[PDB]
Every structure is written in structure tokens, then in C-alpha cells.
Amino acid sequence: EPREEAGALGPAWDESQLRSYSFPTRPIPRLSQSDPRAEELIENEEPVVLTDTNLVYPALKWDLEYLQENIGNGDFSVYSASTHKFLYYDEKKMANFQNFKPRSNREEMKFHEFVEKLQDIQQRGGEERLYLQQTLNDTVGRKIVMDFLGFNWNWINKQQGKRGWGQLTSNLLLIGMEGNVTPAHYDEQQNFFAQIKGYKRCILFPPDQFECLYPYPVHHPCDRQSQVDFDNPDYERFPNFQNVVGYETVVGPGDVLYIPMYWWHHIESLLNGGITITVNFWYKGAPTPKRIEYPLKAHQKVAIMRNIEKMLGEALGNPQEVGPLLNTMIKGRYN
Numbered sequence: 001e002p003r004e005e006a007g008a009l010g011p012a013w014d015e016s017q018l019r020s021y022s023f024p025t026r027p028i029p030r031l032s033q034s035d036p037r038a039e040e041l042i043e044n045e046e047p048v049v050l051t052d053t054n055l056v057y058p059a060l061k062w063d064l065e066y067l068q069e070n071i072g073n074g075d076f077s078v079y080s081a082s083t084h085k086f087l088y089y090d091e092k093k094m095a096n097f098q099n100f101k102p103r104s105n106r107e108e109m110k111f112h113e114f115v116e117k118l119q120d121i122q123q124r125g126g127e128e129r130l131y132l133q134q135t136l137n138d139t140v141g142r143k144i145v146m147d148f149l150g151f152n153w154n155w156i157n158k159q160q161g162k163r164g165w166g167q168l169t170s171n172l173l174l175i176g177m178e179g180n181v182t183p184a185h186y187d188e189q190q191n192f193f194a195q196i197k198g199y200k201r202c203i204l205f206p207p208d209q210f211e212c213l214y215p216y217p218v219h220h221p222c223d224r225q226s227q228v229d230f231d232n233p234d235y236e237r238f239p240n241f242q243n244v245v246g247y248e249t250v251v252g253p254g255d256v257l258y259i260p261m262y263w264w265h266h267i268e269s270l271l272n273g274g275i276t277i278t279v280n281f282w283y284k285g286a287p288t289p290k291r292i293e294y295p296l297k298a299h300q301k302v303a304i305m306r307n308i309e310k311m312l313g314e315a316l317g318n319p320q321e322v323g324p325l326l327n328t329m330i331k332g333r334y335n
């Protein structure tokens with residue numbers, strides 16, 4: 001249920017701001033950083049919302065005005081779309097599938113141009129949607145460097161050390177409009193998802209529901225995204241989507257969601273909730289142990305399936321031949 005803001009300021013959000021879907025969910029635990037149950041969840045690679053990390057405490061003052069004045073004059077990747085879904089597509093892989101035409105268009109612009117183009121849309125009451133997704137780098141201004149240095153690195157660095165993870169891969173700044181949706185997908189890295197402004201509904205599915213979410217081919221630009229349209233699921237093509245069960249939560253300013261590697265997640269900015277701001281922390285997972293302990297975890301099988309598809313695309317000399325050969329291997333033999 002919705003949490004209540006301090007000072008009797010009412011519920012931060014209500015159920016009417018959530019989109020409706022066909023599957024059931026149960027809540028992700030919201031725990032304190034000092035709760036041993038939170039440490040045992042991160043250790044067992046299960047999601048958890050940490051409410052009091054102070055991970056991005058200096059950034060909780062961030063808004064469009066503050067950022068525009070201090071985030072520098074670097075280039076920011078801004079995506080536009082006529083729909084609320086911002087399906088990710090790997091541009092490097094668009095050569096393999098010359099028939100894929102993205103629904104989102106990427107435009108590289110300055111931050112003040114992003115704010116202005118967002119102002120125009122609001123002014124003219126247009127229905128275009130924008131989503132800024134840019135990796136933080138050296139080009140940021142002094143005040144943002146101060147904020148960045150003010151994050152609680154003492155806490156997240158200990159997490160990195162306790163779990164044997166690799167190095168921090170990147171920090172992605174996310175600024176989207178109310179109603180924006182990032183369709184279900186899984187990342188190969190560990191992710192700490194630090195909410196700053198606004199509220200986001202996060203629906204996670206464990207790796208063992210691979211069969212229910214039907215990822216695109218590895219060589220397809222939408223590699224690691226689900227093929228299922230959550231708004232209009234095609235049960236004829238994707239019958240096991242009727243068996244999907246998610247883990248749900250709504251994160252607000254100060255909350256940090258641990259999204260374990262290979263876990264699916266569907267993210268949506270709450271309807272009529274204003275703009276959302278997020279910063280995520282990606283870490284390379286711990287190395288694969290030398291002695292493999294059976295039975296294999298679900299994510300290890302996903303890793304195996306990915307490698308088979310990759311090798312097959314390399315050996316055949318064309319990723320388009322992957323499907324035909326795989327079907328030839330199974331039809332009347334393993335099915």
C-alpha cells in the first residue's frame with residue numbers, strides 16, 4: 001500500500017496512478033540498511049528496497065533548474081516517442097536486422113535544450129514524450145561534482161566488497177516524464193537503483209521466469225527486452241506469459257532498489273506524478289567460481305542460452321541463420 005509522507009502531508013501517491021496489467025504481484029521488502037534481512041537478501045541476490053542509505057542524499061535537492069545551472073554543457077542523450085513505452089534498442093545490432101525501425105528516436109542535445117523542448121511540449125499541451133538517459137561523466141559542473149562526491153560511497157563500496165562484485169561500471173542519469181514506461185528487460189550487471197525525484201513503480205521477475213517473458217534473439221537490437229506487450233499480451237505467441245508473477249514496489253526520493261543481475265524489471269513513472277529523476281549504480285557481477293556447484297542457478301542457464309546463440313551466430317557466419325538451425329536441431333528430436 002502507499003506510504004504516508006511525514007508531516008501529515010498525505011499519501012505521496014495513490015493506486016490510481018499505476019497502470020493495470022494482467023499478472024499478479026507481491027511486494028518487494030522495504031527494509032533499513034541496518035536490517036540483517038536486507039543483507040541476507042542482497043547476499044542471496046533477491047531484490048530489496050533500502051529506505052535509509054543516504055546513497056544520493058546530496059542529489060535529493062536536484063531539479064531541472066538546479067541541474068540546468070550546474071550540470072555543465074555536455075551532450076545528453078534524449079529519447080522521443082509518440083507512445084509511453086521507451087523500448088531500448090542496441091544501435092550496434094541494428095545492422096543484423098535492417099527491418100527493425102525503432103519507435104523511439106534519439107537526439108543528442110544540451111541540457112538547456114532538453115528543458116526547453118520539455119517546456120514547449122508542456123506549453124502547447126502536446127502528447128510527445130521525452131526520456132533523458134545519459135551516463136554521468138567528467139563534463140559535469142563543479143556543484144554536481146560536489147554532490148557526486150557527497151554520495152554515501154562508504155556504504156556502497158562495502159556492498160561491492162562484501163559481494164565480491166567487480167568495479168562500478170557507470171552511473172546513468174534518468175530524467176523522464178510522468179507516465180513513461182521502460183518495458184521489461186534484464187541487465188547482466190548488478191544494479192543499485194537510487195530514486196531522487198518523483199516516484200517509479202518497479203515490477204521485477206526472477207530469472208527463472210525466462211520461459212514466461214520471451215526475450216528477443218540475442219542478435220536482435222532489443223536483446224534482453226521482453227517481446228510481450230504488457231498492455232496487450234499476445235497469448236497465442238507467448239502462452240507462458242499467463243504464468244508470470246512479479247515482485248512490485250514504488251520507490252520515492254531516498255529509496256534505493258537493489259535489482260540483482262539477470263532479474264527482469266519493468267519501470268514506469270507514476271501517472272500524473274511529474275518528472276522523475278533517478279541515478280543507478282552498475283557493478284560487474286562476481287566472477288564465476290572455478291568449481292561449478294550443481295544444480296545450476298536460473299541465471300547460469302540464461303548465460304548458457306546466450307552463449308549458444310552467440311556462438312551459433314559466429315559459426316554460421318550470419319545471425320539470421322540461428323533460428324533455422326535451432327529449429328532443425330529440435331523438431332522431432334527434443335520436442
Ligand SMILES: C[C@@H](CC(=O)O)C(=O)C(=O)O
Nearest residue numbers: 174182187191267278280
Ligand atoms: C533505464 C532503467 C529503467 C528506468 O528507470 O527507466 C534501467 O533499466 C536501469 O537502471 O537498470
Ligand SMILES: [Zn+2]
Nearest residue numbers: 185186187191
Ligand atoms: Zn536496466
